[PDB]
From a paper:
[name] forms a dimer in the asymmetric unit, and the NAD+ cofactor can be seen bound to the protein. In the [name] structure, there is additional density adjacent to the nicotinamide ring that, given the high resolution of the second structure, we were able to unambiguously identify as citric acid from the crystallization buffer. Oxidoreductase proteins typically have a catalytic triad of K (found in the EKP motif), D, and H (often found as a DXXXH motif; in some enzymes Y replaces the H) and a fourth residue, which is positively charged. [name] has Lys-93 and His-178 which correspond to the Lys and His of the catalytic triad, and Lys-163 occupies the “fourth” position. However, [name] has His-175, which occupies the position typical for the Asp in the catalytic triad. The closest structural match (0.8 Å over 341 residues) is the recently solved crystal structure of YjhC oxidoreductase from E. coli, which also has a HXXH motif. The following mutants of [name] were constructed: K93A, K163A, H175A, H176A, and H178A. The purified mutants lost enzymatic activity, as demonstrated by electrospray ionization spray MS (ESI-MS), supporting the hypothesis that they are catalytically important.
[name] (RUMGNA_02695) from [name] ATCC 29149 catalyzes the equilibration of 2,7-anhydro-Neu5Ac and Neu5Ac. The novel oxidoreductase identified in our work showed to catalyze the conversion 2,7-anhydro-Neu5Ac to Neu5Ac in the presence of NAD+ in a reversible manner. The protein shows a Rossman fold typical of NAD-binding protein of the Gfo/Idh/MocA class characterized by a central β-sheet with helices on either side. Here, we showed that [name] acts through a multistep mechanism involving a keto intermediate and cycling of NADH/NAD+.
Author numbering:
A (entry chain A): -1 to 205, 209 to 372
B (entry chain B): 1 to 205, 209 to 369
Write the structure that this text describes.
């Protein structure tokens, strides 16, 4: 029984890109043909035992490149996805898809028009506890979802070098760089809100031009709401998603790692990740890095925690399945139709606008009933 | 020790109990009460007179001070007439259901030279007082952010209480204004700009909003988030205070205070003893499925934690009315600053929500 090989290029072979390469390489029917990275491409090509390309059009033009993993910095996703689509190459793109809805919409439409595949790297949807939460919600356990509350709040000391992840024009700041929590809320509420308000600023880090506190206030259709908090100036650390419905509530805690279901007077626990060891390992890490959350951000030469390494495996395996003709499940459909890429960058843009312009923003002000 | 004669206007759950308390303080007598419904009953218990007209009641020689504990909508008439007749005033939260109403009440009492104490009882919680001591000493550094919540689940009762009618209670924002007052005290004033969202999500048929989310912008790059309501199946009741060097949590569901500074973590009591804190926690656990039973009625009794701060407060008030100097700590409960700041910001939030836009507090002060 043959089983067809797909040739993968990797564009951007830093912390996350290098590791997606290590992972895809060892999946069934998958080969790393070549990578592109001006800084770290020679190094990671020696490790993966593949070629080095320096031009996108040359790279995509190769017969042996049928698919590309895009993991450049957040601001540099546009050019690699558009050229792969132009050369008939299927695409996986890291979060955040882009730093503007214009950019994200052009990327999804180009890939649709050239009939290639576009998978959005919204990796939180592969977390065991997120999947369990969706199963419980769809089964009607907590009833209709009324309210989601996210937070991703820690304290970051000012480092010796300022990373690109810390520059707003390159990272898009906390809202874009940690968009997982916005995407998560949007998935659980079944789409975008009608209207957002975001406040915050740089409260403690004025000396890294990023906002260090952000507070979002979302109004959804048919009387539902959400509140989302981010940043790097909170001396009381918090990282969770809370889901409150007509019959019950669910908490996915990522600081004290565990899931909680509340129904009647009853209270069940469930795993966020693949095993009690992964959950407990996460909890140890957050305890260790309470005084300085800055050490938690990846660099070329560092390695992801267990919980993250495992969902990267789940995700690279799901992607490889798709590219071998596997049917997509309703559960992950929105990572390919483009609905989730668009919904996350739309709402992010809407929030960014709200804050810089000091006013409430309708999501129509970013969509416009486009196509 | 001189005797002060107190009238009580409104002798339901809270008013009756403030009377029981003041009665047994040094230099304090309950001369008479007024309550169409429950006045005859509570006058038999307190062994005092019954009046049916405010002007007649205040006109008595023997009435030098009034405790006002009518429903939230009915504070205006009793405070203005007491001021007109030279009578000193204590008024229950929320002072009024409009800034116009609250401003008129503070100015009338100032103009007639009588005393006006705002019943912002959360400021007498041991853990609130401790939090202020820590903040002012510089332990957590500059306060950047406050996060309050008061979120539980209320089942729909057989009869609709006035506390559940928006026109009469002013809804969660006014009826549970303690948390807004608390944040305003810790941030040292009102915000520059507010946004409030929410609605009736689960209770359509009790016209109150059952979820409210406030987003406050303060001067010099500071913020707060405040949550309220009666449609949350994950109960939460706390105030969290995050600064440049540390953070403090006052938890009222899992009752205890927490200080975080460097890698250190200290516990402190919210209330007067570990028994009061634990008693609170038991109650919140007991009433998780229906927080509606926690709201007072004529004939019912406040928890230990609440009974005790009512004692702290009635004693502080009685001290003031015996010529005791006010401490900087409670000054704003008499100057009118706290009554005005709480109803201004509440009005601003209410406006924001019904009009679907951000509201500057200049739009209420100016
Ligand atoms: N899904 C997740 O959980 C997760 C976690 C971390 C990072 N990420 C995402 O991964 C992507 C990369 O982030 P990272 O953590 O690897 O950062 P990083 O600094 O570790 O990696 C960036 C790499 O891109 C290279 N690069 C720079 N310019 C390039 C160009 N023009 N073409 C190709 N490569 C170029 C850099 O030299 C570096 O090797 C981002 O989209 C980021 O948001 C995702
Ligand atoms: N500070 C606190 O912790 C706290 C707690 C509960 C209530 N309160 C406040 O106490 C006040 C009353 O609340 P409650 O719990 O006692 O409500 P309640 O229903 O228990 O008592 C209200 C009483 O006012 C009487 N009343 C009605 N109209 C009147 C009028 N025109 N003149 C005089 N009395 C009149 C009613 O008959 C009733 O006896 C409100 O301001 C409320 O917000 C404060």
């Amino acid at each position: 029984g043959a089983m067809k090989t797909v040739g993968y290029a990797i564009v951007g072979t830093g912390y996350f890109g290098a590791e997606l390469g290590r992972i895809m390489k060892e999946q069934e029917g998958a080969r790393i043909v070549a990578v592109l990275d001006p800084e770290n491409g020679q190094t990671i090509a020696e490790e993966l035992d593949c070629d080095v390309e320096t031009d996108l059009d040359t790279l995509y033009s190769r017969e042996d490149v049928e698919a590309v993993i895009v993991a450049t910095p957040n601001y540099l996703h546009k050019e690699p996805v558009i050229k792969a689509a132009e050369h008939g190459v299927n695409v996986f793109c890291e979060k955040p898809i882009a730093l503007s809805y214009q950019d994200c919409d052009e990327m999804v439409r180009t890939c649709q028009e050239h009939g290639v595949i576009f998978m959005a790297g919204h990796v939180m949807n592969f977390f065991h506890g997120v999947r369990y939460a969706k199963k419980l919600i769809n089964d009607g356990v907590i009833g209709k979802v009324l309210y989601c509350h996210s937070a991703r709040n820690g304290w970051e000391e000012q480092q010796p070098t300022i990373s690109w992840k810390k520059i707003r024009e390159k990272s898009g700041g906390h809202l874009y760089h940690h968009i997982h929590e916005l995407d998560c809320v949007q998935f659980l509420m079944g789409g975008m809100p009608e209207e957002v308000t975001m406040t915050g600023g740089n409260v403690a880090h004025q000396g890294g031009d990023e906002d260090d506190m952000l507070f979002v206030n979302m109004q959804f259709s048919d009387n539902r709401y959400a509140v989302l908090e981010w940043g790097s100036a909170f001396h009381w650390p918090e990282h969770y998603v809370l889901i409150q419905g007509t019959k019950g509530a669910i908490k996915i805690d990522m600081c004290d790692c565990g899931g909680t279901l509340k129904v009647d007077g009853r209270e069940e626990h469930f795993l966020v990740h693949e095993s009690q060891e992964e959950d407990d390992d996460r909890t140890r890490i957050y305890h260790g890095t309470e005084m300085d959350g800055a050490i938690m951000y990846g660099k070329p030469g560092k390695k992801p925690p267990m919980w993250l390494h495992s969902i990267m495996k789940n995700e690279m395996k799901y992607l490889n399945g798709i590219l071998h003709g596997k049917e997509v499940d309703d559960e992950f459909r929105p990572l390919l139709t483009g609905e989730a890429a668009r919904a996350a960058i739309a709402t992010a843009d809407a929030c960014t606008k709200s804050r810089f312009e000091d006013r409430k923003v309708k999501l129509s002000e970013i969509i416009g009933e486009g196509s």
